[PDB]
């Protein structure tokens, strides 16, 4: 099993250093190679590098600011890549094959967690609750939906919850997209009857543990 | 160096039939250097098929890997639910370990029609200055659907970001979420919003309209 | 030489004098197992070898028996029962340089592990795997052999050390190598107690 560090928020021009260590194997006779992938895209290569010389390769695109190392006290091995961009927000992964001698298994079965890096210059903030109350022009049939937008947060992770986690049946959340402000926004809906609405308390919880902040915006139909 | 290509782009293929993944190369690989990985959305991948003929430890029967040369197959004998992820081809013996643009296998159901959902800005948002209005389609399979909004019997475009949800389980039918954020300027300038929608599964492009005189 | 190519030479048909070894006050370690190396001066054997080497300053400590690493397994391993002594000191001045010194090497992988004193010269590309390398390096196929890089910066931990073993052989044999003998100046015309030879 491979352990990686955890996730970074890091400023453009600079650089970062990611670990990765291994434990439960002979990890002299292993190699580790470095995979990153986007936000739903394919994945890429970054280079691989033999534990037991230190000889590194390295795709041609990253050959000038990615550097692989290793320590063999802490049988840990590092990336460093400088001048970092925005496009370099992504997550990485390192794979080893499994070795218990002289002998080695011939594939990459091993993998790890993953690490998240995002590069960027806006800093933290929370964020802004926005009823989206359900209308007559909404209301269609019977069915009508109805929800909260999550605006300008920083920080990727959010939840959205409804009556306390209570009323979860037809709730939609939709993956959050950017900005051209470089602050993230969601939308999160669910799905009532026409005659639900005036009879329940509707209300979603939204939290956002960067900022600490953790609203209970209640949503009312509009008039 | 190698480049590795997946012909087949997505195959929306109901449980039970059989299963074929291509990849290709364009100059001659080494059969000992070849894999196959299998990916969910959210999970480190796990290796499937090794050495263009054999399988990892505790891969099921299912799989199997065939050809050489140029050209590599990958069959599942009958699908399973958790056998619908995204597959990678992968080379391991030039210097450049080029991956595969990848291919995702969904389930196959019968065509649903979508519903339209319109969403009026809330009044306290008026006091950030910017508008955001949502139109929101519901349950279609097909993933293909477009929607342009309309503002004044005109086309604006830039502002129109889309959200796509991940494929349901209980009936696996995709919802969207379009988010028109306009500048409070252009919305006074203007009187008549509205999304309209075009879908492999209506017959015509529905309308959605609304009117700021009804707020 | 280098650790992986350990040089020999057989000494035998001599006077030698340990003494001078013993009071250079140069060395930095200085073990002698199983002799005295006080006495080594009253005791004759028939023939000794001398091996020497360049390594870690860190390694030193895998020249002895009964030590586990990938010097004793791969380069240079000695006989539990080894007698003979180990020196070693540091030569900073002469073998680190600036740029670093790439002449000397070491052995990093192995099939098998080495019996006490021999030699390994071969440089047959390893085979990690389970698949023929067939004379090409890449992925599970690997060079046997790697250099280390002295530095005149560097720690004195990872600074060069010069290492010497010494041998004794004993065998039915004439048993010519062996240290000198002092003698006074005569006196006669008295009683005295002498011993001329034997």
Same mark, same amino acid.
């Given at each position: 099993?491979?352990?990686?560090?955890?996730?970074?928020?890091?400023?453009?021009?600079?650089?970062?250093?990611?670990?990765?260590?291994?434990?439960?194997?002979?990890?002299?006779?292993?190699?580790?190679?470095?995979?990153?992938?986007?936000?739903?895209?394919?994945?890429?290569?970054?280079?691989?590098?033999?534990?037991?010389?230190?000889?590194?390769?390295?795709?041609?695109?990253?050959?000038?600011?990615?550097?692989?190392?290793?320590?063999?006290?802490?049988?840990?091995?590092?990336?460093?890549?400088?001048?970092?961009?925005?496009?370099?927000?992504?997550?990485?992964?390192?794979?080893?094959?499994?070795?218990?001698?002289?002998?080695?298994?011939?594939?990459?079965?091993?993998?790890?967690?993953?690490?998240?890096?995002?590069?960027?210059?806006?800093?933290?903030?929370?964020?802004?609750?926005?009823?989206?109350?359900?209308?007559?022009?909404?209301?269609?049939?019977?069915?009508?939906?109805?929800?909260?937008?999550?605006?300008?947060?920083?920080?990727?992770?959010?939840?959205?919850?409804?009556?306390?986690?209570?009323?979860?049946?037809?709730?939609?959340?939709?993956?959050?997209?950017?900005?051209?402000?470089?602050?993230?926004?969601?939308?999160?809906?669910?799905?009532?009857?026409?005659?639900?609405?005036?009879?329940?308390?509707?209300?979603?919880?939204?939290?956002?543990?960067?900022?600490?902040?953790?609203?209970?915006?209640?949503?009312?139909?509009?008039? | 160096?190698?480049?590795?290509?997946?012909?087949?782009?997505?195959?929306?293929?109901?449980?039970?039939?059989?299963?074929?993944?291509?990849?290709?190369?364009?100059?001659?690989?080494?059969?000992?250097?070849?894999?196959?990985?299998?990916?969910?959305?959210?999970?480190?991948?796990?290796?499937?098929?090794?050495?263009?003929?054999?399988?990892?430890?505790?891969?099921?029967?299912?799989?199997?890997? &065939?050809?050489?040369?140029?050209?590599? $197959? /990958? =069959?599942? !004998?009958?699908?399973?639910? @958790?056998?619908?992820? #995204? +597959?990678? *081809?992968?080379?391991?013996?030039?210097?450049?370990?080029?991956?595969?643009?990848?291919?995702?296998?969904?389930?196959?159901?019968?065509?649903?029609?979508?519903?339209?959902?319109?969403?009026?800005?809330?009044?306290?948002?008026?006091?950030?200055?910017?508008?955001?209005?949502?139109?929101?389609?519901?349950?279609?399979?097909?993933?293909?659907?477009?929607?342009?909004?309309?503002?004044?019997?005109?086309?604006?475009?830039?502002?129109?970001?889309?959200?796509?949800?991940?494929?349901?389980?209980?009936? &696996?039918?995709?919802?969207?979420?379009? $988010? /028109? =954020?306009? !500048?409070?300027?252009?919305? @006074?300038?203007?009187? #008549? +919003?509205? *999304?309209?929608?075009?879908?492999?599964?209506?017959?015509?492009?529905?309308?959605?309209?609304?009117?700021?005189?009804?707020? | 030489?280098?650790?992986?190519?350990?040089?020999?030479?057989?000494?035998?048909?001599?006077?030698?004098?340990?003494?001078?070894?013993?009071?250079?006050?140069?060395?930095?370690?200085?073990?002698?197992?199983?002799?005295?190396?006080?006495?080594?001066?009253?005791?004759?054997?028939?023939?000794?070898?001398?091996?020497?080497?360049?390594?870690?300053?860190?390694?030193?400590?895998?020249?002895?028996?009964?030590?586990?690493?990938?010097?004793?397994?791969?380069?240079?391993?000695?006989?539990?029962?080894?007698?003979?002594?180990?020196?070693?000191?540091?030569?900073?001045?002469?073998?680190?340089?600036?740029?670093?010194?790439?002449?000397?090497?070491?052995?990093?992988?192995?099939?098998?592990?080495?019996?006490?004193?021999?030699?390994?010269?071969?440089?047959?590309?390893?085979?990690?795997?389970?698949?023929?390398?067939?004379?090409?390096?890449?992925?599970?196929?690997?060079?046997?052999?790697?250099?280390?890089?002295?530095?005149?910066?560097?720690?004195?931990?990872?600074?060069?050390?010069?290492?010497?073993?010494?041998?004794?052989?004993?065998?039915?044999?004439?048993?010519?190598?062996?240290?000198?003998?002092?003698?006074?100046?005569?006196?006669?015309?008295?009683?005295?107690?002498?011993?001329?030879?034997?």
């Amino acid at each position: 099993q491979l352990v990686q560090s955890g996730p970074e928020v890091k400023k453009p021009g600079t650089s970062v250093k990611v670990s990765c260590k291994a434990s439960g194997f002979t990890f002299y006779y292993s190699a580790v190679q470095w995979v990153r992938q986007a936000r739903g895209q394919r994945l890429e290569w970054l280079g691989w590098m033999a534990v037991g010389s230190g000889k590194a390769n390295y795709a041609q695109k990253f050959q000038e600011r990615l550097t692989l190392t290793r320590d063999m006290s802490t049988s840990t091995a590092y990336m460093e890549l400088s001048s970092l961009r925005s496009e370099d927000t992504a997550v990485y992964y390192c794979a080893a094959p499994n070795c218990t001698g002289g002998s080695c298994y011939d594939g990459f079965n091993l993998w790890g967690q993953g690490t998240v890096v995002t590069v960027s210059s806006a800093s933290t903030k929370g964020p802004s609750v926005f009823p989206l109350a359900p209308s007559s022009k909404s209301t269609s049939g019977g069915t009508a939906a109805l929800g909260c937008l999550v605006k300008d947060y920083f920080p990727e992770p959010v939840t959205v919850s409804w009556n306390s986690g209570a009323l979860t049946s037809g709730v939609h959340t939709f993956p959050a997209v950017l900005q051209s402000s470089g602050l993230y926004s969601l939308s999160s809906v669910v799905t009532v009857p026409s005659s639900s609405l005036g009879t329940q308390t509707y209300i979603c919880n939204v939290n956002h543990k960067p900022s600490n902040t953790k609203v209970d915006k209640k949503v009312e139909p509009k008039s | 160096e190698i480049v590795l290509t997946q012909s087949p782009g997505t195959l929306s293929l109901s449980p039970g039939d059989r299963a074929i993944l291509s990849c290709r190369a364009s100059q001659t690989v080494n059969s000992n250097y070849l894999a196959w990985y299998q990916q969910k959305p959210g999970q480190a991948p796990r290796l499937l098929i090794y050495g263009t003929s054999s399988r990892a430890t505790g891969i099921p029967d299912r799989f199997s890997g &065939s050809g050489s040369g140029t050209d590599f $197959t /990958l =069959t599942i !004998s009958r699908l399973e639910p @958790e056998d619908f992820a #995204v +597959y990678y *081809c992968q080379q391991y013996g030039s210097s450049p370990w080029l991956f595969g643009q990848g291919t995702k296998v969904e389930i196959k159901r019968t065509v649903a029609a979508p519903s339209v959902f319109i969403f009026p800005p809330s009044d306290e948002q008026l006091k950030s200055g910017t508008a955001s209005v949502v139109c929101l389609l519901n349950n279609f399979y097909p993933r293909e659907a477009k929607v342009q909004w309309k503002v004044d019997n005109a086309l604006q475009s830039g502002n129109s970001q889309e959200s796509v949800t991940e494929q349901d389980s209980k009936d &696996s039918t995709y919802s969207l979420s379009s $988010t /028109l =954020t306009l !500048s409070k300027a252009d919305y @006074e300038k203007h009187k #008549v +919003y509205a *999304c309209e929608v075009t879908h492999q599964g209506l017959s015509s492009p529905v309308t959605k309209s609304f009117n700021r005189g009804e707020c | 030489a280098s650790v992986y190519a350990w040089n020999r030479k057989r000494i035998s048909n001599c006077v030698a004098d340990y003494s001078v070894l013993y009071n250079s006050a140069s060395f930095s370690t200085f073990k002698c197992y199983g002799v005295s190396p006080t006495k080594l001066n009253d005791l004759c054997f028939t023939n000794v070898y001398a091996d020497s080497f360049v390594i870690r300053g860190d390694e030193v400590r895998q020249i002895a028996p009964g030590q586990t690493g990938k010097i004793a397994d791969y380069n240079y391993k000695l006989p539990d029962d080894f007698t003979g002594c180990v020196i070693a000191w540091n030569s900073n001045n002469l073998d680190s340089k600036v740029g670093g010194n790439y002449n000397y090497l070491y052995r990093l992988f192995r099939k098998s592990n080495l019996k006490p004193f021999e030699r390994d010269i071969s440089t047959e590309i390893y085979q990690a795997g389970s698949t023929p390398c067939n004379g090409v390096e890449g992925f599970n196929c690997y060079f046997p052999l790697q250099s280390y890089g002295f530095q005149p910066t560097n720690g004195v931990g990872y600074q060069p050390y010069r290492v010497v073993v010494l041998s004794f052989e004993l065998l039915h044999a004439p048993a010519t190598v062996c240290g000198p003998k002092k003698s006074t100046n005569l006196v006669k015309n008295k009683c005295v107690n002498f011993n001329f030879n034997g």
